[PDB]
Design an enzyme around this catalytic site. Structure first.
Site, PDB file in Angstrom:
ATOM      1  N   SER C 157       0.747  -1.265   0.000  1.00 46.04           N
ATOM      2  CA  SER C 157       0.000   0.000   0.000  1.00 46.04           C
ATOM      3  C   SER C 157       0.785   1.330   0.000  1.00 46.04           C
ATOM      4  N   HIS C 240      -6.920   4.926  13.084  1.00 47.73           N
ATOM      5  CA  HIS C 240      -8.006   5.817  12.676  1.00 47.73           C
ATOM      6  C   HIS C 240      -7.865   6.238  11.208  1.00 47.73           C
ATOM      7  N   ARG C 438     -18.397  -7.226  23.063  1.00 52.51           N
ATOM      8  CA  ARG C 438     -17.859  -7.655  21.771  1.00 52.51           C
ATOM      9  C   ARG C 438     -16.922  -8.835  21.999  1.00 52.51           C
TER      10      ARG C 438
HETATM   11  C1  HEA Z   1     -15.214   3.796   7.039  1.00 57.36           C
HETATM   12  C2  HEA Z   1     -15.424   3.553   8.327  1.00 57.36           C
HETATM   13  C3  HEA Z   1     -15.654   4.496   9.461  1.00 57.36           C
HETATM   14  C4  HEA Z   1     -15.944   5.824   9.414  1.00 57.36           C
HETATM   15  C5  HEA Z   1     -16.035   6.745   8.212  1.00 57.36           C
HETATM   16  C6  HEA Z   1     -16.002   6.249  10.814  1.00 57.36           C
HETATM   17  C7  HEA Z   1     -16.373   7.504  11.220  1.00 57.36           C
HETATM   18  C8  HEA Z   1     -16.505   7.922  12.534  1.00 57.36           C
HETATM   19  N1  HEA Z   1     -16.307   7.129  13.655  1.00 57.36           N
HETATM   20 FE1  HEA Z   1     -15.717   5.233  13.710  1.00 57.36          FE
HETATM   21  N2  HEA Z   1     -15.294   3.346  13.755  1.00 57.36           N
HETATM   22  C9  HEA Z   1     -15.113   2.512  12.705  1.00 57.36           C
HETATM   23  C10 HEA Z   1     -15.355   2.852  11.373  1.00 57.36           C
HETATM   24  C11 HEA Z   1     -15.580   4.113  10.877  1.00 57.36           C
HETATM   25  N3  HEA Z   1     -15.754   5.196  11.695  1.00 57.36           N
HETATM   26  C12 HEA Z   1     -14.494   1.220  13.123  1.00 57.36           C
HETATM   27  C13 HEA Z   1     -13.919   0.082  12.240  1.00 57.36           C
HETATM   28  C14 HEA Z   1     -14.476   1.278  14.480  1.00 57.36           C
HETATM   29  C15 HEA Z   1     -14.087   0.185  15.439  1.00 57.36           C
HETATM   30  C16 HEA Z   1     -12.661  -0.285  15.447  1.00 57.36           C
HETATM   31  C17 HEA Z   1     -12.389  -1.181  16.607  1.00 57.36           C
HETATM   32  O1  HEA Z   1     -12.200  -0.641  17.728  1.00 57.36           O
HETATM   33  O2  HEA Z   1     -12.386  -2.408  16.393  1.00 57.36           O
HETATM   34  C18 HEA Z   1     -14.950   2.587  14.875  1.00 57.36           C
HETATM   35  C19 HEA Z   1     -14.924   3.040  16.213  1.00 57.36           C
HETATM   36  C20 HEA Z   1     -15.229   4.330  16.649  1.00 57.36           C
HETATM   37  C21 HEA Z   1     -15.081   4.876  18.001  1.00 57.36           C
HETATM   38  C22 HEA Z   1     -14.705   4.151  19.312  1.00 57.36           C
HETATM   39  C23 HEA Z   1     -15.718   3.135  19.878  1.00 57.36           C
HETATM   40  C24 HEA Z   1     -15.195   2.350  21.076  1.00 57.36           C
HETATM   41  O3  HEA Z   1     -15.402   2.831  22.217  1.00 57.36           O
HETATM   42  O4  HEA Z   1     -14.591   1.256  20.885  1.00 57.36           O
HETATM   43  C25 HEA Z   1     -15.402   6.140  17.897  1.00 57.36           C
HETATM   44  C26 HEA Z   1     -15.436   7.060  18.909  1.00 57.36           C
HETATM   45  O5  HEA Z   1     -15.089   8.208  18.740  1.00 57.36           O
HETATM   46  C27 HEA Z   1     -15.829   6.407  16.536  1.00 57.36           C
HETATM   47  C28 HEA Z   1     -16.340   7.630  16.033  1.00 57.36           C
HETATM   48  C29 HEA Z   1     -16.514   7.984  14.704  1.00 57.36           C
HETATM   49  C30 HEA Z   1     -16.803   9.326  14.258  1.00 57.36           C
HETATM   50  C31 HEA Z   1     -16.974  10.551  15.106  1.00 57.36           C
HETATM   51  C32 HEA Z   1     -16.860   9.282  12.891  1.00 57.36           C
HETATM   52  C33 HEA Z   1     -17.220  10.394  11.943  1.00 57.36           C
HETATM   53  O6  HEA Z   1     -16.435  10.315  10.742  1.00 57.36           O
HETATM   54  C34 HEA Z   1     -18.685  10.455  11.514  1.00 57.36           C
HETATM   55  C35 HEA Z   1     -19.009  11.614  10.584  1.00 57.36           C
HETATM   56  C36 HEA Z   1     -20.383  11.511   9.950  1.00 57.36           C
HETATM   57  C37 HEA Z   1     -21.407  12.261  10.351  1.00 57.36           C
HETATM   58  C38 HEA Z   1     -21.278  13.085  11.590  1.00 57.36           C
HETATM   59  C39 HEA Z   1     -22.705  12.253   9.622  1.00 57.36           C
HETATM   60  C40 HEA Z   1     -22.753  13.161   8.416  1.00 57.36           C
HETATM   61  C41 HEA Z   1     -22.694  14.646   8.780  1.00 57.36           C
HETATM   62  C42 HEA Z   1     -23.778  15.429   8.978  1.00 57.36           C
HETATM   63  C43 HEA Z   1     -25.141  15.037   8.511  1.00 57.36           C
HETATM   64  C44 HEA Z   1     -23.599  16.791   9.640  1.00 57.36           C
HETATM   65  C45 HEA Z   1     -24.569  17.146  10.768  1.00 57.36           C
HETATM   66  C46 HEA Z   1     -24.416  16.210  11.945  1.00 57.36           C
HETATM   67  C47 HEA Z   1     -24.055  16.550  13.203  1.00 57.36           C
HETATM   68  C48 HEA Z   1     -23.992  17.998  13.593  1.00 57.36           C
HETATM   69  C49 HEA Z   1     -23.679  15.468  14.222  1.00 57.36           C
HETATM   70  N4  HEA Z   1     -15.635   5.310  15.752  1.00 57.36           N
HETATM   71  C1  HEA Z   2     -14.891  -3.975   5.160  1.00 53.55           C
HETATM   72  C2  HEA Z   2     -15.324  -4.124   6.425  1.00 53.55           C
HETATM   73  C3  HEA Z   2     -16.262  -5.196   6.920  1.00 53.55           C
HETATM   74  C4  HEA Z   2     -17.421  -5.587   6.340  1.00 53.55           C
HETATM   75  C5  HEA Z   2     -17.876  -5.138   4.959  1.00 53.55           C
HETATM   76  C6  HEA Z   2     -18.125  -6.472   7.280  1.00 53.55           C
HETATM   77  C7  HEA Z   2     -19.217  -7.233   6.985  1.00 53.55           C
HETATM   78  C8  HEA Z   2     -19.756  -8.153   7.876  1.00 53.55           C
HETATM   79  N1  HEA Z   2     -19.338  -8.306   9.226  1.00 53.55           N
HETATM   80 FE1  HEA Z   2     -17.886  -7.486  10.185  1.00 53.55          FE
HETATM   81  N2  HEA Z   2     -16.312  -6.771  11.095  1.00 53.55           N
HETATM   82  C9  HEA Z   2     -15.299  -6.015  10.538  1.00 53.55           C
HETATM   83  C10 HEA Z   2     -15.237  -5.638   9.193  1.00 53.55           C
HETATM   84  C11 HEA Z   2     -16.222  -5.854   8.224  1.00 53.55           C
HETATM   85  N3  HEA Z   2     -17.400  -6.593   8.474  1.00 53.55           N
HETATM   86  C12 HEA Z   2     -14.303  -5.625  11.535  1.00 53.55           C
HETATM   87  C13 HEA Z   2     -13.161  -4.647  11.355  1.00 53.55           C
HETATM   88  C14 HEA Z   2     -14.651  -6.201  12.721  1.00 53.55           C
HETATM   89  C15 HEA Z   2     -13.868  -6.105  14.033  1.00 53.55           C
HETATM   90  C16 HEA Z   2     -13.173  -7.416  14.420  1.00 53.55           C
HETATM   91  C17 HEA Z   2     -12.688  -7.433  15.858  1.00 53.55           C
HETATM   92  O1  HEA Z   2     -13.552  -7.277  16.755  1.00 53.55           O
HETATM   93  O2  HEA Z   2     -11.462  -7.608  16.077  1.00 53.55           O
HETATM   94  C18 HEA Z   2     -15.923  -6.889  12.456  1.00 53.55           C
HETATM   95  C19 HEA Z   2     -16.647  -7.576  13.426  1.00 53.55           C
HETATM   96  C20 HEA Z   2     -17.830  -8.228  13.146  1.00 53.55           C
HETATM   97  C21 HEA Z   2     -18.718  -8.722  14.110  1.00 53.55           C
HETATM   98  C22 HEA Z   2     -18.533  -8.711  15.637  1.00 53.55           C
HETATM   99  C23 HEA Z   2     -17.970 -10.004  16.252  1.00 53.55           C
HETATM  100  C24 HEA Z   2     -17.646  -9.825  17.705  1.00 53.55           C
HETATM  101  O3  HEA Z   2     -17.072  -8.760  18.040  1.00 53.55           O
HETATM  102  O4  HEA Z   2     -17.990 -10.726  18.512  1.00 53.55           O
HETATM  103  C25 HEA Z   2     -19.754  -9.300  13.428  1.00 53.55           C
HETATM  104  C26 HEA Z   2     -20.829  -9.984  13.987  1.00 53.55           C
HETATM  105  O5  HEA Z   2     -21.911  -9.916  13.515  1.00 53.55           O
HETATM  106  C27 HEA Z   2     -19.524  -9.103  12.045  1.00 53.55           C
HETATM  107  C28 HEA Z   2     -20.376  -9.482  11.059  1.00 53.55           C
HETATM  108  C29 HEA Z   2     -20.308  -9.079   9.770  1.00 53.55           C
HETATM  109  C30 HEA Z   2     -21.317  -9.393   8.829  1.00 53.55           C
HETATM  110  C31 HEA Z   2     -22.576 -10.121   9.205  1.00 53.55           C
HETATM  111  C32 HEA Z   2     -21.010  -8.877   7.631  1.00 53.55           C
HETATM  112  C33 HEA Z   2     -21.896  -8.881   6.472  1.00 53.55           C
HETATM  113  O6  HEA Z   2     -22.529  -7.610   6.258  1.00 53.55           O
HETATM  114  C34 HEA Z   2     -21.179  -9.241   5.182  1.00 53.55           C
HETATM  115  C35 HEA Z   2     -22.018  -8.978   3.957  1.00 53.55           C
HETATM  116  C36 HEA Z   2     -21.167  -9.338   2.772  1.00 53.55           C
HETATM  117  C37 HEA Z   2     -20.579  -8.372   2.047  1.00 53.55           C
HETATM  118  C38 HEA Z   2     -21.045  -6.957   2.108  1.00 53.55           C
HETATM  119  C39 HEA Z   2     -19.407  -8.633   1.138  1.00 53.55           C
HETATM  120  C40 HEA Z   2     -19.973  -8.580  -0.249  1.00 53.55           C
HETATM  121  C41 HEA Z   2     -19.043  -7.680  -0.988  1.00 53.55           C
HETATM  122  C42 HEA Z   2     -18.139  -8.236  -1.797  1.00 53.55           C
HETATM  123  C43 HEA Z   2     -17.872  -9.675  -1.661  1.00 53.55           C
HETATM  124  C44 HEA Z   2     -17.371  -7.526  -2.903  1.00 53.55           C
HETATM  125  C45 HEA Z   2     -17.607  -8.264  -4.212  1.00 53.55           C
HETATM  126  C46 HEA Z   2     -16.647  -7.754  -5.265  1.00 53.55           C
HETATM  127  C47 HEA Z   2     -16.972  -7.109  -6.405  1.00 53.55           C
HETATM  128  C48 HEA Z   2     -18.380  -6.634  -6.652  1.00 53.55           C
HETATM  129  C49 HEA Z   2     -15.952  -6.818  -7.471  1.00 53.55           C
HETATM  130  N4  HEA Z   2     -18.387  -8.370  11.847  1.00 53.55           N
HETATM  131 CU    CU Z   3     -11.362   6.210  15.174  1.00 51.69          CU
END
Ligand code: HEA
Ligand code: HEA
Ligand code: CU
Ligand code: CU
Ligand code: CU
Ligand code: MG
Ligand code: ZN
Lengths: 43, 98, 514, 261, 51, 56, 227, 84, 47, 75
Positions: C157, C240, C438
């Site tokens: 990457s 993040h 979880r």
């Molecule tokens: C693509 C994926 C994605 C995106 C984009 C985001 C976006 C955001 N996430 Fe994240 N988040 C995850 C994926 C993502 N996250 C994952 C994977 C984890 C768990 C990882 C792990 O611990 O395993 C996680 C965990 C996680 C945590 C910790 C939870 C814990 O205790 O373990 C927090 C806390 O701050 C958080 C916050 C947010 C916030 C503030 C945004 C913001 O970007 C949201 C912004 C969007 C909006 C706000 C809505 C659109 C805006 C408006 C309509 C404006 C008007 C609205 C207001 C004035 C509120 N996320």
């Molecule tokens: C890309 C991010 C991704 C996506 C898409 C999903 C999809 C799914 N995940 Fe998630 N999940 C994670 C990332 C993702 N997950 C991560 C980061 C964790 C944290 C692990 C941890 O705790 O350490 C998690 C944890 C997690 C949990 C919690 C387990 C636990 O903490 O005990 C569960 C349980 O329901 C779950 C379920 C599912 C399910 C039901 C789907 C379903 O929605 C899947 C549906 C299927 C699809 C949407 C895939 C189809 C798309 C394609 C195959 C692309 C095809 C290609 C072309 C078209 C070219 N996931």
């Molecule tokens: Cu974060």
């Protein structure tokens, strides 16, 4: 977005076949392994 | 200090590098490294689009600050016009190609 | 011949195709893993066994979907396929290096598969935090293999990030400013920068973890004076930015899809849109600690991180509202891709709104490590990142292939998947508010209803990804060749026909300097 | 069409990416064998194919630029960007290690004696050899600059002379650092101080070796008249990398050798 | 003594190196073959005159 | 010293329809095959080790 | 504890947990407002044959939609931060209990005066007496005095664990080599359940927490009979 | 601790070659001497089995698995105590 | 470049026979979906 | 004495040092009152506090360290 008619059209029967096959290829292997879970958990 | 010994581009540059080197000094630009300067674009003063074939994609930034470039193929023949602002473009054969 | 074309490539189109193929297949593995997860949780009791075999499954699910499906598809697939075409470049800056980026992926995937085979695999969570990931609680080659898989995927990457930034900056037509490139290109140029700065810190972290368990170092071992929390900082500093790296290219595709099907020339507020992603990318670097609210940090710093995290809502908001403004006076076409774009806009809003809730440290105390956070990220990933991938896939498929998809079938596929994902993740908000933790293979009797409904939804999703495979087959079986494409004046990618020739822009593009 | 009219480079299909990818597999899994089933054969093969790949991949690049002339101005500007960006990812790699260090030294855990350096550790003296290593690296900074200036002025002999002096100082540091390791009264296993020290200064050490073989390559390319007074990116890069290396040492010196000891 | 120095002489030695270096290798391995030198014979899979 | 980049430029610019990694002769070819062989073999060997380590 | 078909938070046994419920209601009210606003605008946009595909002026409306979200964030931030500090507040506890996470059980230590310490393990679903909760009952409950400010100190003796008790609105990770502090203060007697909130190995789901709160009098007699 | 000094406004290769032999190299010589004079051989530190040192959670991948890489017996004790 | 161009020719697999294709897609996606199942099985059969 | 009171120099979620400091303090005072006599006066306060806050296992291991003389703190 326009396109020419299919050079090699896929009639419903043909689709039904490809759809069935596509499903089986996903469902069978998993089903088998899942079907025998207990045997594994008991050696 | 004092002395010499290292080659120069003029004397050691080859391939396409050399070609653009020379072409550049004659004031010409065969490998499109520079931005083409616009004409008045009127039917009588069309922008002349050089080409090594019989069609070339033209991108037209209608107004100076525009964020959208209007794209289209310019073919060999009569002058053509940007779909969004007229502006004539006319294909022309590409001279230097080595 | 085949070798030279497919193993020794230097073609952005072919490498991009190779990615989509890798991503789709990896997508199958991840789907299978997600089903075992819901299979285990769909009835009170244990199906597989202890939290080890279960968590091994949960871990592979995360790594596979994040590093092997989403990233390869969006950045390597669409990135390589479309970028050069959108800026009028003959190819990328480093054609050869670009190929290594791709080929580093299959081996990386092997190491990850290998990890779950030897010993008892890695039941550490995708965060692979120590002491659990250490050589005591997780002795054996497993975690080490998980680490090496991550090293390769990271090398892959940042090498590609280097290629995209160079290309995008250095290979546009001489008269075209950066404020003249399309949002998708901007979207990947910015994502590329996040990768360049976050990925190395991760590699620094896991290399320290690797030495701690093979070379007797104690970076994260209290005994030697280490600190398990230090790993949390390093991991999350990358962790993040990583999620934004995951949604940004999606933001871009959405901007393209919404504009195209609204019959508009350009998206509303283009410079606001560029500003928004840049802000999002930047704030995304100074908020890592919101993932460590219950770790024992100072109240003050805990206050900083909740505030810093909240301001990300503003720019994200200008984007949501801009896409809406784009739909405004549009001549809407209810195509499959437009359906995916609308779903994204809503679902992503809900999932990000739910993330603002978690932004609060006080409330996060009781929400952390529960299923509420599992709901948050599946909304933004399963119906955010993934919906963008599907919309982009159905929208550009004809360009990539030259053939068309059966729109009706394609619409059926949206209907099924829309129901499936909501049924799967909606209940999970409750399970989390009500306390279900979880990473549990089983739960107290009370959580039985929602977990049941949840698991049923995952089966509907299964049905949808099976149907999609078929939908692709049929497209290729029938062979309806593309004839005409709309709005090409404003969409360069389509100007060379479907599919564009091996070599595009052999003779540049003419752009006047007004 | 047919004949291109853009100044870019369309590189011929190369097997090297595949070969280097396979190499990474072999080295990673090979380390796993060494670490666990006590075997290096796999690690040995990987290191081998890897050198083979780098040699060839870079040999071709030289062929395409110096012999074939594909490095037009546009192509070069792109290489500059690439290098800068690469050096950047590296700067952030080292940042993980200074983070680690500062984290530990600023808040020493009780198991250490609640102090820094931990009780039982006898830190080296910054004013002894560390001070020497510092002056050596810094001098090669001035000499590599002299080299660069001779090259632009077409002074073959002098560029060679300066490049040589630069290279030996880099080697001198390597040896000096090697002895320090051997005489150091602490090891990688001596808790967090040893970890923090040996991996940061160690990775840097690896970088001085990587930078020295790079300058060596530049040396020979010059003996063979590859560089012209105006087109010598291979050298510009070697030079940029070499500076990145002094700078990292300056932070190491001040942070680990002086402040944290 | 300075005559040895010279532009051709550098190129010349450069040219003669393969032939004379080859001799050294041939002379060295052959000399090992003549004194029947020990520790390298440890390293030969075939010619172990030792049991 | 020498300076015969001119000889090599010509050698490498020669229109023999050869890819740069082979444009230089027979050694290029042996190096290539050696490299390719070691990689594939190694890869095979690695798969064997993993199959072997998968088991208790 | 949690009952069947529950939607929101478990009932607040302590005052900060009450405070949280109200903050969540506030925050949730807003996410409902925005999420429904967006949905309305979307359906609005897609429901007319009228077109206007020419250029539209941005920026003008761009301020409304940038200043508004900014005000709303303050409306959430303020309450949030107040509760945040209120939690890390200057209080004087009348008791200090320690808990140490272990691979698959917690152990407690009441050592202000005497060295009292026991192990708390989950009761195998097999040996549960009717009416006992399947994966939540522990053999030795952690007994504490109701209506009193207790200071809990969480740590671990191996991998990471997290000690949590939702009804009281508590959750603190247990990091080896570290002493994390938290203030417990139930305002009502009873049995309050919680579970390990951190992945810690094979039996991560099977190492619960059960708080039993009785009056001081009974607390001290319990404490003594415990050694 | 300096501030700076003799400006020579025009810098070409002659200037850098001047700094190389007139500043850079002379410093490397001084420090070399300094380090050659301060070459005081410290008597191997007293051994005391501190637990935060000589860490061993997994035997090293080489030798007897108890010897660190650049092991110097004179100044590096094993966990048990000095080598010999 | 002797690289063929056009629909069905810019891919590393043959799209000329819809049923051979059917087989290939089936093995491709199929083997991918089955892998996790067989890994779990493998882990369940160890000691 | 009820329990160790709030300590301004240790105002945050992390009390590790609180436990550590008082354990040192006590043993440092102890050693002095011993090697001075001063009517063998005694610093109980520190012991009450450190016993309350420090988990048993830490105190134990520290005591052992102090026994074999491998205790890293300076007393
Ligand atoms: C693509 C994926 C994605 C995106 C984009 C985001 C976006 C955001 N996430 Fe994240 N988040 C995850 C994926 C993502 N996250 C994952 C994977 C984890 C768990 C990882 C792990 O611990 O395993 C996680 C965990 C996680 C945590 C910790 C939870 C814990 O205790 O373990 C927090 C806390 O701050 C958080 C916050 C947010 C916030 C503030 C945004 C913001 O970007 C949201 C912004 C969007 C909006 C706000 C809505 C659109 C805006 C408006 C309509 C404006 C008007 C609205 C207001 C004035 C509120 N996320
Ligand atoms: C890309 C991010 C991704 C996506 C898409 C999903 C999809 C799914 N995940 Fe998630 N999940 C994670 C990332 C993702 N997950 C991560 C980061 C964790 C944290 C692990 C941890 O705790 O350490 C998690 C944890 C997690 C949990 C919690 C387990 C636990 O903490 O005990 C569960 C349980 O329901 C779950 C379920 C599912 C399910 C039901 C789907 C379903 O929605 C899947 C549906 C299927 C699809 C949407 C895939 C189809 C798309 C394609 C195959 C692309 C095809 C290609 C072309 C078209 C070219 N996931
Ligand atoms: Cu974060
Ligand atoms: Cu636990
Ligand atoms: Cu746990
Ligand atoms: Mg946690
Ligand atoms: Zn125009």
């Amino acid at each position: 977005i326009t396109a020419k008619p299919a050079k090699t059209p896929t009639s419903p029967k043909e689709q039904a076949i490809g759809l069935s096959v596509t499903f089986l290829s996903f469902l069978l292997p998993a089903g088998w392994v899942l079907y025998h879970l207990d045997n594994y958990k008991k050696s | 200090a004092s002395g010499g010994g290292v080659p120069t581009d003029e004397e050691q540059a080859t391939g396409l590098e050399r070609e653009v080197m020379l072409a550049a000094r004659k004031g010409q630009d065969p490998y499109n490294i520079l931005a083409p300067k616009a004409t008045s674009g009127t039917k009588e003063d069309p922008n002349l689009v050089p080409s090594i074939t019989n069609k070339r994609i033209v991108g037209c930034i209608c107004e100076e600050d525009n964020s959208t470039v209007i794209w289209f193929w310019l073919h060999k023949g009569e002058a053509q016009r940007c779909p969004s602002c007229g502006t004539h473009y006319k294909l022309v054969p590409h001279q230097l190609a080595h | 011949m085949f070798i030279n074309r497919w193993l020794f490539s230097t073609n952005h189109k072919d490498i991009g195709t190779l990615y989509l193929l890798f991503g789709a297949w990896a997508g199958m593995v991840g789907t299978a893993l997600s089903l075992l997860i819901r299979a285990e949780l769909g009835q009170p009791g244990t199906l597989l066994g202890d939290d080890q075999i279960y968590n091994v499954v949960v871990t592979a699910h995360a790594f596979v979907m994040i590093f092997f499906m989403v990233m390869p598809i969006m950045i390597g697939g669409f990135g390589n396929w479309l970028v050069p075409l959108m800026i009028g470049a003959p190819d990328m800056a480093f054609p050869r290096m670009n190929n290594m980026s791709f080929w580093l992926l299959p081996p990386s995937f092997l190491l990850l598969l290998a990890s779950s085979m030897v010993e008892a695999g890695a039941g550490t969570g995708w965060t692979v935090y120590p002491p659990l990931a250490g050589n005591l609680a997780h002795a054996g080659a497993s975690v080490d293999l998980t680490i090496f898989s991550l090293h390769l995927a990271g090398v892959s990457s940042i090498l590609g990030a280097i290629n995209f930034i160079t290309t995008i900056i250095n290979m546009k037509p001489p008269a075209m400013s950066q404020y003249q490139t399309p949002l998708f290109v901007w979207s990947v140029m910015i994502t590329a920068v996040l990768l360049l700065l976050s990925l190395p810190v991760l590699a620094a972290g896991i290399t320290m973890l690797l030495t701690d368990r093979n070379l007797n170092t104690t970076f994260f071992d209290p005994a030697g004076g280490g600190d398990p929390i230090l790993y949390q900082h390093l991991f999350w500093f990358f962790g993040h930015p990583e999620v934004y790296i995951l949604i940004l290219p999606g933001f871009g595709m959405i901007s393209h899809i919404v504009t195209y099907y609204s019959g508009k020339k350009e998206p509303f507020g283009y410079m606001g849109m560029v500003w928004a992603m840049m802000s999002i990318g930047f704030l995304g670097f100074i908020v890592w600690a919101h993932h460590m609210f219950t770790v024992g940090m100072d109240v003050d710093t805990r206050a900083y991180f909740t505030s810093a995290t909240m301001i990300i809502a503003i720019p994200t908001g200008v984007k949501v509202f801009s896409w809406l403004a784009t739909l405004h006076g549009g001549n809407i076409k209810w195509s499959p891709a437009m359906m995916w774009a609308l779903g994204f806009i809503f679902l992503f809003t809900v999932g990000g709104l739910t993330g603002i809730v978690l932004a609060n440290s006080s409330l996060d105390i009781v929400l952390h490590d529960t299923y509420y956070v599992v709901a948050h990220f599946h909304y933004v990933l399963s119906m955010g990142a993934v919906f963008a991938i599907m919309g982009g896939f159905v929208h550009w498929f004809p360009l990539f292939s030259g053939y068309t998809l059966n729109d009706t079938w394609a619409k059926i596929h949206f209907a099924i998947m829309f129901v499936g994902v909501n049924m799967t993740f909606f209940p999970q908000h409750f399970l989390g508010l009500s306390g279900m933790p979880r990473r549990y293979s089983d739960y107290p009797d009370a959580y039985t209803m929602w977990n049941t409904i949840s698991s049923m939804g995952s089966f509907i999703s299964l049905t949808a990804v099976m149907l999609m495979v078929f939908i692709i087959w049929e497209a290729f079986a029938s062979k309806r060749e593309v004839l005409t494409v709309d709005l090409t004046t404003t969409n360069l990618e389509w100007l060379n026909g479907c599919p564009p020739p091996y070599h595009t822009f052999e003779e540049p593009t003419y752009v006047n300097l007004k | 069409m047919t004949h291109q009219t853009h100044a870019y480079h369309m590189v011929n299909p190369s097997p090297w990416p595949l070969t280097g990818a396979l190499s990474a597999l072999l080295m990673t899994s090979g380390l796993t064998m060494w670490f666990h089933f006590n075997s290096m054969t796999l690690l040995m093969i990987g290191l081998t194919t890897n050198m083979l790949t780098m040699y060839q991949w870079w040999r071709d690049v030289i062929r395409e630029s110096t012999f074939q002339g594909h490095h037009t101005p546009a192509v070069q500007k792109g290489l500059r960007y690439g290098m800068i960006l690469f050096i950047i990812s590296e700067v952030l790699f080292f940042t993980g290690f200074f983070w680690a260090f500062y984290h530990s030294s600023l808040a020493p855990t009780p198991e250490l004696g609640g102090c820094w350096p931990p009780t039982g550790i006898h830190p080296l003296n910054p004013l002894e050899v560390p001070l020497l290593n510092t002056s050596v690296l810094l001098a090669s900074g001035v000499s590599i600059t002299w080299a660069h200036h001779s090259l632009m002025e077409g002074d073959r002999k002098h560029m060679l002379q300066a490049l040589f002096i630069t290279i030996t100082l880099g080697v001198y540091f390597t040896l000096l650092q090697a002895s320090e390791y051997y005489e150091a009264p602490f090891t990688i296993s001596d808790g967090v101080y040893g970890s923090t020290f040996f991996v940061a200064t160690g990775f840097h050490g690896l970088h001085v070796i990587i930078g020295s073989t790079f300058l060596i390559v530049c040396f020979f390319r010059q003996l063979k008249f590859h560089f012209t007074s105006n087109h010598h990116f291979g050298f510009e890069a070697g030079a940029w990398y070499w500076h990145f290396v002094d700078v990292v040492w300056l932070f190491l010196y001040v942070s680990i050798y002086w402040w944290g000891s | 003594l300075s005559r040895f120095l010279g532009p051709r002489y550098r190129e010349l030695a450069r040219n003669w190196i393969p032939t004379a270096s080859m001799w050294g290798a041939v002379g060295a391995v052959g000399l090992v073959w003549a004194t029947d030198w020990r520790l390298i014979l440890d390293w030969v899979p075939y010619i172990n005159g030792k049991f | 010293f020498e300076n015969r980049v001119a000889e090599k430029q010509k050698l490498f610019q020669e229109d023999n329809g050869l890819p740069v990694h082979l444009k230089g002769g027979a050694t290029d070819n042996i190096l290539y095959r050696v490299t390719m062989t070691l990689c594939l073999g190694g890869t095979l060997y690695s798969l064997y080790c993993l199959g072997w380590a998968s088991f208790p | 504890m949690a009952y069947p078909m529950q939607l929101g938070f478990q009932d607040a046994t302590s005052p900060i947990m009450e405070e949280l419920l109200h903050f969540h209601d506030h925050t949730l009210m807003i996410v409902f407002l925005i999420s429904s606003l967006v949905l309305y605008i979307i359906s609005l946009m897609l429901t007319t044959k009228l077109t206007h595909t020419s250029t539209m002026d941005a920026q003008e409306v761009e301020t409304i939609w940038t200043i508004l979200p900014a005000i709303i964030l303050i409306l959430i931030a303020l309450p949030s931060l107040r509760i945040l500090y209120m939690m890390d507040e200057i209080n004087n506890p009348s008791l200090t209990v320690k808990t140490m996470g272990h691979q698959w059980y917690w152990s407690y230590e009441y050592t202000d005066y005497e060295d009292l310490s026991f192990d708390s393990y989950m009761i195998p679903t097999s040996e549960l007496k009717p009416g006992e909760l399947r994966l939540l009952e522990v053999d030795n409950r952690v007994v504490l005095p109701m209506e009193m400010t207790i200071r809990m100190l969480v740590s671990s003796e191996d991998v990471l664990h997290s000690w949590a008790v939702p009804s009281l609105g508590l959750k603190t990770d247990a990091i080896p080599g570290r002493l994390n502090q938290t203030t417990l203060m139930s305002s009502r007697p009873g049995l309050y359940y919680g579970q390990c909130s951190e992945i810690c190995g094979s039996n991560h789901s099977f190492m619960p927490i059960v708080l039993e709160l009785v009056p001081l009098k009974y607390f001290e007699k319990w404490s003594a009979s415990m050694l | 601790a300096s501030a700076a000094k003799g400006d020579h406004g025009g810098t070409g290769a002659r200037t850098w070659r001047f700094l190389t032999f007139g500043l850079a190299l002379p410093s490397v010589a001084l420090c070399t001497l300094n380090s050659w004079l301060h070459s005081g051989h410290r008597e191997r530190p007293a051994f005391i089995p501190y637990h935060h040192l000589r860490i061993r959670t997994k035997p090293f991948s080489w030798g007897d698995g108890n010897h660190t890489f650049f092991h110097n017996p004179r100044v590096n004790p094993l966990p048990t105590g000095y080598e010999k | 470049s002797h690289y063929e161009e056009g629909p069905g020719k810019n891919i590393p697999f043959s799209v000329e026979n819809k049923w051979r294709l059917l087989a290939m897609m089936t093995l491709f996606f199929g083997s991918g979906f089955a892998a996790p199942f067989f890994i779990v099985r493998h882990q369940l059969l160890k000691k | 004495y009820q329990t160790a009171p709030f300590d301004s120099r240790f105002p945050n979620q992390n009390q590790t040092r609180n436990c550590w400091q008082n354990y040192l303090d006590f043993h440092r005072c102890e050693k002095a009152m011993t090697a001075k006599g001063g009517d063998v006066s005694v610093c109980e306060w520190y012991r009450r506090v450190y016993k309350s806050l420090c988990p048993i296992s830490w105190v134990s291991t520290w005591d052992d360290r102090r026994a074999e003389g491998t205790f890293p703190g300076k007393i």
